[PDB]
Nucleic acid binder design. Structure first.
Ligand SMILES: [Mg+2]
Ligand SMILES: [Mg+2]
Ligand SMILES: [Mg+2]
Ligand SMILES: [Mg+2]
Ligand SMILES: [Mg+2]
Ligand SMILES: [Mg+2]
Ligand SMILES: [Mg+2]
Ligand SMILES: [Mg+2]
Ligand SMILES: [Mg+2]
Lengths: 43, 32, 117, 273, 87, 93, 96, 64
RNA sequence: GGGAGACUGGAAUUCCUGGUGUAGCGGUGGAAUGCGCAGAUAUCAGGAGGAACACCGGUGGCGAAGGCGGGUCUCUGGGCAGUAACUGACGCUGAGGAGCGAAAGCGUGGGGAGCGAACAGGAUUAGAUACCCUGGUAGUCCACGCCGUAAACGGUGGGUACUAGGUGUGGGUUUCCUUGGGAUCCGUGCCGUAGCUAACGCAUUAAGUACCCCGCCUGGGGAGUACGGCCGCAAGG
């Protein structure tokens, strides 16, 4: 999860957003959890 | 690698071309 | 003399000086000004204050003829465009509309070399 | 262009015209008229134009420069012959009427193709057309100087006039020299560029060919006496002793037409460079 | 390059049997026809520099096929040569 | 395909950035505007990269593999711990 | 033969009642040389984007010709030489 | 943008140099051609749209 | 954007003409050589000409390598997939040789807008024959021909069977949904273990595991120089 202080040459799959906001980080983690769950359900 | 050998070759080629430019007229007078 | 209700204005603001020239919708200029004419010279011509002074001088010269509303046409980059627009709008003239009429060469004439300094 | 071999000193770098595009080797007996050399002497018998003397006698090969008549009558080219008095080959027309005439044979004029004069003619190299009907921007040659006066501009080989934008009763022409002239639109013009473009690159090699063409030697004034040329001889190789001046005392100045002539048609002279 | 009829007729004329596509003689005939077409194309456009390389490649393939047929059966090779008018 | 909306993405507050000295000069591919000294992030490129990463994760889980988390700050330790205990996946707090 | 689409922009000063006869007279050459089906679409009196030979609007026309390359080239040449025509654009409809 | 395409996916539309409305819905406000990253289309249809816009500008159907 | 030939158009710079129009314009970290008061700079209309075709335009496409993108028309080379029909070893390399071959330069006839070798001056410096500024001859452009030189770099030759893979991109086909995913073969990317190396780094597009072929080397300068020979109008290789 990158921000204004990340390196695009280092990160390959940039996921912009914000990591300082606790609520934003929690929502992003929930979204990632839902995504991995929808990916697992296919097996 | 480095540029030492390249600079040496450049200097040698430049001196050779200067000598050729200087002796062009004499070479032409001899080869005419 | 003549009378003109409204017209256009052209702001050629290069990296050295700003030339403001007001004209009629036909294309006949009647009042122009610049930093070189207002007093600045050399590098002092490429400044926002000199551009504002030239713009206000042009606005005064146009009001002396009877111009009230102008449509602004700014040119290529250069510090003093917004400053000249503000000076024109504050000297007692209406901005009306603003357009950036900049010549964009589509890879036309080859530009000069690059500065090595 | 055919370059001769360096067999003798007279053929070191000599060249000649390939003579391509020429079908017949003889002219039309009915369109041949006599003409004798003059050696540059006017009616008074005195040598007027220097450097003109012995040369191979030639025929006239009458060429119609007006083409005012035979508008709706087409004509197919028969042969492409050589003309000594001209700089480019000539073309023999076989008019559908029955008569034959000669043309300057512009570039790209093959044998068998048909041309058609008149106002309703198509824009193609070879046929005549009035400037009023010729669209602006095309290329023409040997058009005229006055209505029905005859072709007088761009008649040499490889040269051509550029018809710029016309306006009113006048059309603008750019000459091969670069001059911008104006001519009344009522003038008949020939479309296409003159043929024999390879001309002007022939190396004569020796003085024999120029002497056969009728060009005598030319003596420079520096090697003459003060009584013959302003560039006095002196004692040694002199550079002239003064500014360059004609043998009759005329300096290398404008020497143009008299002041205030009937030159209202010209709008821009040529450039010196 | 070649249409579906001008090529089908050449195949039927220079083939070994019915529905014979790719035989030595048929391939050589097709390569010769393409070589003539490319030679005319180059005579029209004498500064291609790519059609010339293609022509050289096709000529190399034709030479390889000719060598193969000559090493296999000299009779068929000479027959094809006399029928096509090469060398 | 789209799973999250820009409305929710903006209501959550996932567009703030760092100060002037803590900015990456090479981030010209994602910066859109600078309001009140805060670098604003784009939305369309982010939505596209989200789908790209979704496809990547789908292919990864199809081939066989889970996602492992990591964290060191003292502001989301319990959050990540609960998420991990719920989803059955690695985590470090 | 091959198919081609010719977009013609004529002079706006002319009337709409002389566009079809002119196009027919210009296409008679193809009709007599190669022969093909014709499809004329006249929707002139359209404002142009920029100026063309000191003109504001123009008369657009679309023609479809399944004829030879030489035929379409001669037609384009005649249209360009004509004075009433202002612009011509020939496109290939089969593949290109 | 972010969508597959309107031609490579809808498979029910063509690209012609006469569809002034279709070309105006794709070019920018200043008459410039939009980038593929903004239009969200396949490379083939993007090149086709570019060629169509160029033909329109040549036949004087757009203000360049 | 594979090449060749032909036609055609826009932006932009330069020049000229017809209007408006003043005492500055160009230029630099500051300053003038330059353009003006003979009407400079600047704006509207018209005309002349030549290079290149903004936006689409990119870790994207093609080509054997150079290299190639305004639009239209004629020809043509190369490559991919599917059917899988046809001859059935005809497969790969290649000493000499032949062809193509970045830019620069020369001859012929043109054109030359801008840029711009040399050349003139303005400015700094103790000295500027340069970096900066002002004009500009060859050159950059067209057709016929020439020398065969580049960091022609992927500094990595062409061909064949294999080596966890992960993941964007261009193309042609299939099973599962019914717009989304798996499989199929080639190119183009970036990481990565096994393996290779002195390390950098390569790592299915090898620099790895194996083989056929051509060229090169046995220390740096001398010297890619002299001699003789070959190509070449000349430079030059
Ligand atoms: Mg004489
Ligand atoms: Mg004497
Ligand atoms: Mg005397
Ligand atoms: Mg003496
Ligand atoms: Mg060899
Ligand atoms: Mg060159
Ligand atoms: Mg030259
Ligand atoms: Mg200079
Ligand atoms: Mg040597």
């Amino acid at each position: 999860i990158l921000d204004t202080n990340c390196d695009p040459d280092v990160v390959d799959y940039p996921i912009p957003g914000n990591d300082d906001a606790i609520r934003s980080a929690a929502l992003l983690t929930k979204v990632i959890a839902s995504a991995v769950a929808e990916g697992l359900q296919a097996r | 690698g480095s540029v030492i050998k390249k600079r040496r070759k450049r200097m040698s080629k430049k001196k050779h071309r200067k000598l050729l430019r200087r002796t062009r007229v004499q070479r032409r007078k001899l080869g005419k | 003399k003549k009378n003109v209700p409204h017209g256009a204005a052209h702001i050629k603001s290069t990296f050295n000086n700003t030339i403001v020239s007001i004209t009629d919708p036909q294309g006949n200029v009647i009042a122009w000004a610049s930093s070189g004419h207002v007093g600045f010279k050399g590098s002092r011509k490429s400044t926002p204050f000199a551009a504002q002074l030239a713009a206000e001088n042009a606005a005064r010269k146009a009001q002396e003829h009877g111009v009230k509303k102008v449509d602004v046409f700014v040119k290529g980059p250069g510090s003093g465009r917004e400053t000249a627009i503000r000076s024109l709008q504050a000297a007692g003239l209406e901005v009306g509309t603003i357009s950036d009429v900049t010549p964009q060469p589509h890879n036309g004439c080859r530009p000069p070399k690059r500065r090595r300094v | 262009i055919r370059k001769y071999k360096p067999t003798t000193p007279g053929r070191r770098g000599a060249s000649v015209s390939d003579f391509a595009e020429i079908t017949r080797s003889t002219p039309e007996k009915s369109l041949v008229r006599p003409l004798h050399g003059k050696g540059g002497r006017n009616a008074h018998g005195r040598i007027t134009t220097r450097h003109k003397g012995g040369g191979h006698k030639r025929a006239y090969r009458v060429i119609d420069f007006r083409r005012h008549d035979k508008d709706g009558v087409n004509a197919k080219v028969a042969h492409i012959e050589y003309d000594p008095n001209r700089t480019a080959n000539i073309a023999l027309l076989h008019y559908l009427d029955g008569e034959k005439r000669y043309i300057i044979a512009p570039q790209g004029l093959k044998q068998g193709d048909v041309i058609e004069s008149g106002a309703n003619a198509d824009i193609k190299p070879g046929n005549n057309l009035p400037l009023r009907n010729i669209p602006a921007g095309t290329v023409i040659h040997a058009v005229e100087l006055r209505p029905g006066g005859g072709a007088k501009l761009a008649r040499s080989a490889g040269v051509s006039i550029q018809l710029l934008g016309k306006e009113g009763t006048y059309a603008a022409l750019r000459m091969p020299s670069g001059e911008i002239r104006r001519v009344d639109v009522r003038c008949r013009a020939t479309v296409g560029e003159v043929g024999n473009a390879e001309q002007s690159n022939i190396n004569w090699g020796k003085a024999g060919r120029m002497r056969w063409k009728g060009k005598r030697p030319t003596v420079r004034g520096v090697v003459m006496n003060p009584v013959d040329h302003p560039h006095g001889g002196g004692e040694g190789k002199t550079s002239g002793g003064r500014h360059p001046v004609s043998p009759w005392g005329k300096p290398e100045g404008r020497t143009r037409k008299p002041n205030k002539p009937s030159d209202k048609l010209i709008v821009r002279r040529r450039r010196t460079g | 390059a070649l249409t579906a009829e001008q090529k089908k007729e050449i195949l039927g004329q220079y083939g070994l049997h019915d529905t014979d596509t790719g035989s030595p003689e048929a391939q050589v005939a097709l390569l010769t026809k393409r070589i003539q077409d490319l030679t005319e194309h180059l005579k029209v456009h004498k500064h291609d520099h790519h059609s010339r390389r293609g022509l050289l490649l096709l000529v190399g393939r034709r030479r390889r096929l000719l060598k193969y047929v000559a090493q296999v059966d000299v009779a068929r090779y000479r027959s094809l040569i006399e029928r096509l008018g090469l060398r | 395909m789209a799973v999250v909306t820009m409305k929710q993405l903006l209501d959550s507050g996932a567009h703030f950035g760092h100060q002037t000295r803590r900015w990456n000069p090479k981030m010209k591919r994602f910066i859109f505007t600078d309001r009140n000294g805060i670098y604003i992030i784009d939305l369309q490129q982010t939505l596209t990269y989200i789908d790209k990463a979704y496809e990547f994760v789908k292919e990864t889980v199809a081939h066989g593999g889970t996602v492992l988390f990591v964290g060191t700050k003292k502001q989301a330790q319990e959050s990540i711990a609960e998420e991990a205990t719920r989803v059955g996946m690695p985590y470090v707090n | 033969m091959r198919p081609y689409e010719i977009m013609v922009i004529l002079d706006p000063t002319l009337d709409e009642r002389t566009v079809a006869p002119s196009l027919e007279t210009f296409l008679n050459v193809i009709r007599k040389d190669g022969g093909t089906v014709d499809k004329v679409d006249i929707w002139g009196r359209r404002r142009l984007a920029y100026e063309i030979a000191k003109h504001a609007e123009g008369i657009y026309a679309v023609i479809d010709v399944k004829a030879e390359p030489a035929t379409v080239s001669e037609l384009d040449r005649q249209l360009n030489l004509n004075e009433s025509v202002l612009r011509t654009k020939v496109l290939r409809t089969d593949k290109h | 943008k972010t969508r597959k395409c309107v031609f490579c996916s809808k498979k029910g539309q063509t690209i012609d140099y006469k569809d002034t409305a279709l070309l105006r819905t794709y070019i920018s406000e200043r008459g410039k051609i939009r980038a593929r990253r903004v239009t969200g289309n396949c490379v083939q249809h993007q090149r086709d749209i570019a060629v169509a816009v160029k033909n329109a500008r040549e036949v004087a159907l757009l203000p360049f």
